[PDB]
Amino acid sequence: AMLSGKARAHTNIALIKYWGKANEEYILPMNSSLSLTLDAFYTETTVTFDAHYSEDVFILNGILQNEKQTKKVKEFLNLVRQQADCTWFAKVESQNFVASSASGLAALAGACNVALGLNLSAKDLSRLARRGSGSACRSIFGGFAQWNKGHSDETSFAENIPANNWENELAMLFILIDGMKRTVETSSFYQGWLDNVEKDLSQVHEAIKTKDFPRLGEIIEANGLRMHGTTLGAVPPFTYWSPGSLQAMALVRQARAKGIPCYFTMDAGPNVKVLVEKKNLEALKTFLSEHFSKEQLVPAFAGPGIELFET
Amino acid sequence: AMLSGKARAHTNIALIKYWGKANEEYILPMNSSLSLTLDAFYTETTVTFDAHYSEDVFILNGILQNEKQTKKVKEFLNLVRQQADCTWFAKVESQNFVASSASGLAALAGACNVALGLNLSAKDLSRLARRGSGSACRSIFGGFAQWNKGHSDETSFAENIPANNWENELAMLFILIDGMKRTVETSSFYQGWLDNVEKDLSQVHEAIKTKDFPRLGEIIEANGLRMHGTTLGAVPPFTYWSPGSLQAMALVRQARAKGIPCYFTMDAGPNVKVLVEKKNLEALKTFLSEHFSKEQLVPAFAGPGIELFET
């Protein structure tokens, strides 16, 4: 008496940021977001629901996860079990291949979809993954994907953005180096963030249509910096940046000054991701090898959407 | 046929920032600001107006200044000459003792006041110095000073803030490591800056009245960070910070975590200034000597207002 399933999901980098929740219970965002799914980073997850299991068990990269490390997986298992009326405890085994939490929750959503026979469409699998993490709902799709904020659980989900395979000409170079809710609630800059998101989304779409890289890069770099500005207006104010983040951002500006179009974006931690055309990736690595070690510069290209496996 | 005068003016650190101009010609600010005048840093300036001079000459620390280095001094000389109906070229000799541009313009304003016999009140000398630089108008005064934005040339000036000599219990530790107009005009965060200034000023005044140091420190640290957030919303966005600025800010937070009340503020360059009570200054220097050299840690205490000298 057991049900099992497996999925592989790739991480994604938000180019137009998901920043702030309108609804905490359902993970409905304050604004729509847009990402690029990446080939280099992914999670493979297997789930087993078995009447003989006595508790939920989460193993990540061979290591048994403790309660706090299992908290998001357990809450997702409860959600999908309640949706399926399944009364069994589960064993989740994930292996990261190297944002990972998000790819992991996307993979778990697909694995549970398989195991419980939910037969979900891509849209409804995105809606399910959304309940685990917002970024996870975009990793259901490959290449460029947009999470549409929606007004509700039914209308908030992600879809792929057809680029005419422009995504296959791009690359990301990773430079290895409570706050969101605080910012929504207390930051005097949050409204300015909200007022600029839709214009940014529109111009990304116009840039994708014309394959205009400098336009794409300028928009997404300013979008990321606008997100980071908001935390300096929160009460109390904070930054996600580390000294190395600033060094890396300044070096990307230097790179552009030498005629390499490239553009940086950051998330909720100090690392810096650089968008560049495939042509210039190695030149950028060499330039940044002046101030950072080989182990700190990691390339990635466009990746696929979620892959489901019957067990 | 010559007229001469001399003044000494001390620099000041803005605790509630002057950020943005309402009027560029008259230097009327978008908001009121509040500073502490410091003992350690000052400029002494002598001016001579002489019918025999053939051009304006500016010597700074013994070195003849070129045209671009003389631009602000020359514009100030023209302003004060037009106000006095004086047709003579001038020789300005300034010596920095070690923000310096601002202390230098305050000192020049006092020296011209003496030389041309303007017999200005402190208020009117502040109004004159304001035409050279906004910060200069506060350095007319010692200790705590507030530049009231006013609506006009007549109403925009600075005044000392009586503290019951609380300023003599404080200290600043300096850690040595176009954008303003761009931010006013393009930043989606500038209105949030404006909406929070007056509340900050009110609480500084309440803190001074009760000599409440943690309250003063919390307000001014958040005020500075709010100013810096606005530049990340400018078009194009930018930061004044350098990697070392972030390291220093993080170390100040660590210092507080160990029970040393202290609070950081930054201006338009990478250096970091730390407000602390006199009692703890040396402890802070020792703590920061872990990551910075002796030449990078410079203490200062409360300084006096402008001093005028007949020549």
From TrEMBL, chains A, B:
The record's GO CC annotations read:
cytosol
An example Gene Ontology biological process:
isopentenyl diphosphate biosynthetic process, mevalonate pathway
Enzyme Commission code: 4.1.1.33
Domain Mvd1 C-terminal stretches: 173-298
UniProt binding sites for Mg(2+) = 101
What GO terms are given for molecular function?
ATP binding; diphosphomevalonate decarboxylase activity; metal ion binding
Where do the annotations place ADP binding? Answer: 94, 96, 99-101
Keyword annotations of the record: ATP-binding, Lipid biosynthesis, Lipid metabolism, Lyase, Metal-binding, Nucleotide-binding
| InterPro entries, alphabetized | GHMP_kinase_C_sf, Mev_decarb, Mev_diP_decarb, MVD-like_N, Mvd1_C, Ribosomal_Su5_D2-typ_SF, Ribsml_uS5_D2-typ_fold_subgr
Q: Does the keyword Zinc apply?
A: no
Q: Which stretches make up the Diphosphomevalonate decarboxylase-like N-terminal domain?
A: 9-158
Q: Which family does it belong to?
A: Belongs to the diphosphomevalonate decarboxylase family.
Q: What is this protein called?
A: diphosphomevalonate decarboxylase
- The UniProt gene name for this protein comes to mvaD
